[PDB]
Amino acid sequence: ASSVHWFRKGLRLHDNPALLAAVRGARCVRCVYILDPWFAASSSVGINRWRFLLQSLEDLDTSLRKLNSRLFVVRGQPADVFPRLFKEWGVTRLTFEYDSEPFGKERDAAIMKMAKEAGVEVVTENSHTLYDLDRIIELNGQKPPLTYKRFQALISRMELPKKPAVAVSSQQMESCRAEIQENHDDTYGVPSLEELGFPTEGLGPAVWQGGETEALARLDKHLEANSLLASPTGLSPYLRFGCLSCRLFYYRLWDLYKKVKRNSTPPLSLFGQLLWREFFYTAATNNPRFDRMEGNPICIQIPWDRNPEALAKWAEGKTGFPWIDAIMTQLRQEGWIHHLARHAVACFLTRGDLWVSWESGVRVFDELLLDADFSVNAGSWMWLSCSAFFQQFFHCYCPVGFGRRTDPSGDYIRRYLPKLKGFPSRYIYEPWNAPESVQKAAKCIIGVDYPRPIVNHAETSRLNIERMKQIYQQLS
C-alpha cells in the first residue's frame, strides 16, 4: 500500500489504531495535516488555541523525525488537495481517526466518497472517544440519552472501553519510510503564527505547551484558592486535540486506583470527568444544530435578552464584578479556566444575571478556550442555562459570594485585575461597597478606574428565577 494518515484531531502516535491501519502491509506511509492558511488568517478563534495547534503539529514532526519520517503539512482544503495527493503520491489507502461532530461527519463522508471514486481504500477508527457513540444511541432506541443517569445506565450495559492500542514501533516505520525531499520538505514545514496572520509582538512563553510529549509528561506527573491557577496537570486541551488518548487516560486512572485501593473495583465516579465528555459527545453527534437554540430539537426555546453591550462587557471582563472579570481575563489571557469558574461566568451571562443566550457564551468560549470542544462546550452551556437535558433548575452562583468562598485572600483577583491590588480582602470582591477613603487608599475609584457593577445581582437573579419559572409552566 501507499498510505496517508490524515491528522485532524488524534494528534498523537500512541493509541492510534488509524495510523496502524495506514502502516499495515504498507510500502509507503505519509502523515499529513491539511491547513488552509487563508482560512486560518480570517478565523475568529484567538491566538492561544491556534498556537496550541501549531505546537502540537511541531511535536508530531519531532516524533516523526525519530522514526525517520516527517509530518507533511499540506496547505489548502482537503477537497481540492486530496485528488492532487492521490495522484502525485500514487495513494492506495487513506486513514484517519473518526470525527463524531455533525460537520466533521459531513466533510468526511464527502472525502471517502471521492476516495472510493478514486480507487482509494479508506479506513477509520473511533479512538477520540471511550465508546462507539452510535452503539449507545442504538441501545437507547436510536436517540441519544438526555440525562446523565440514563447515559450511565446505557454505559453499564456495554463492554468496557477499548484499551489503548500499541504505539507504532521504531522499526515498523522503517519498512515504509516516506522519501524526505532533503531540506525542501520545509514546503511541508509547520506554519508559524506570523504565517497564519497573527500579530506576535510581545507574546512570551505558552502557559500550556501543545503536543503529545507534553500531554504524556503531564499525565505521568499527575498520577501521584490556588486551584483557580493553571496547574501543571490540566489535560483538557490535550484531550481536545487528541494529544492525549482518552482510553490511555481511563486505564491509567484504573491502574492508579488498583495500586492505591488494592482489593477494589473503582466506582463509575472515578471516570466521571471522561464520562461527562462522552455524554455530550453522544448528545451532539446526530444534532447539526447542537450549538443553537432555534431549530435545536433538544433545546428549550427561551426569550433571552438581546443586549450586545452587556455581552461585550462580559466577554471583555468589564462587568462590575471582580470575580467575574478576573475569570474572563484569565480566560482571554491564558485560554484555560477552572470548571467552577466556567460555571460562575456562564451562570452570570445566562440565567443568573445578564439573561443573554447561552449561544453567545459558547461562541466566546470557542474563541478563547484551548480545549474548546463543539460537543462539550455547547452541551455544558445548554445544561447550566437550564436549556436542555431536563435540567429546569441549577447551581446558584453569587458573582460576589462564590469568589469570596473559593479564594478568601483575594489573591486571584489581585493577579488578574492588578488595578484592584489595593483593596482589603473584605472589599475586593465587591469594591463598590468600600468607603471612598478605602477606594482612594487603594488608588482605584469605582466608576472611574474600574466599572460599577452592571446589574444589581440581588434583584436581577430574583427577576430571572421568576422568568425561568414562567417558561417551564407554559412548557407543561
Where on the chain is the footprint of ligand FAD (CB under 6 A)? 234-236, 239-240, 273-274, 276-277, 280, 338-339, 342-343, 346, 365, 369, 371-373, 376-377, 380-381, 384
| Of 236 and 439, CB closest to ligand FAD | 236
Helix (H) or strand (E) holding 247: helix 246-260
- Measured CA to CA in angstroms, residue 23 lies from 1, 30, 94, 106, 349 at distances of 8, 9, 11, 26, 49
The reply, when asked if residue 366 is annotated as ligand binding, is no
| Of 72 and 279, CB closest to ligand FAD | 279
| Of 120 and 219, CB closest to ligand FAD | 219
Angstrom distance (rounded) from CA 421 to CA 430: 13
Q: How far is the CB of 327 from ligand FAD (least distance, A)?
A: 11
| Of 170 and 227, CB closest to ligand FAD | 227
The reply, when asked if residue 185 is annotated as ligand binding, is no
CA 397 to chain centre: 23
Q: Supply the DSSP symbol for 32.
A: E
Query: Reading across the β-sheet that carries 121-125, which strands appear in turn?
Result: 71-75, 28-35, 2-7, 93-97, 121-125
Q: How far is the CB of 351 from ligand FAD (least distance, A)?
A: 12
The reply, when asked if residue 14 is annotated as ligand binding, is no
The reply, when asked if residue 343 is annotated as ligand binding, is no
Helices (H) and strands (E) in the chain, counts: 21, 5
Q: How far is the CB of 19 from ligand FAD (least distance, A)?
A: 22
- Measured CA to CA in angstroms, residue 332 lies from 292, 349, 368, 411, 416 at distances of 23, 16, 6, 19, 11
| Of 227 and 409, CB closest to ligand FAD | 227
Q: How far is the CB of 383 from ligand FAD (least distance, A)?
A: 8
Residue 125 corresponds to which cell in the numbers above?
477508527
| Of 122 and 206, CB closest to ligand FAD | 206
Residue 470 corresponds to which cell in the numbers above?
414562567
Residue 289 corresponds to which cell in the numbers above?
444544530
| Of 190 and 369, CB closest to ligand FAD | 369
Which amino acid is residue 449, in one-letter code? D
The reply, when asked if residue 411 is annotated as ligand binding, is no
Angstrom distance (rounded) from CA 191 to CA 377: 27
Q: How far is the CB of 44 from ligand FAD (least distance, A)?
A: 15
Angstrom distance (rounded) from CA 344 to CA 314: 12
Q: Supply the DSSP symbol for 3.
A: E
- CB of 152 closer than 8 Å to CB of 269: no
| Of 56 and 236, CB closest to ligand FAD | 236
Q: How far is the CB of 253 from ligand FAD (least distance, A)?
A: 9
Angstrom distance (rounded) from CA 393 to CA 383: 10
Q: How far is the CB of 344 from ligand FAD (least distance, A)?
A: 9
The reply, when asked if residue 372 is annotated as ligand binding, is yes
Q: How far is the CB of 157 from ligand FAD (least distance, A)?
A: 22
Torsional class of 164: left (φ above 0), alpha (ψ -120 to 50), beta (otherwise) = beta
**Residues at the annotated binding site?**
236, 273, 339, 371-373
**Residues at the annotated binding site for FAD?**
236, 273, 339, 371-373
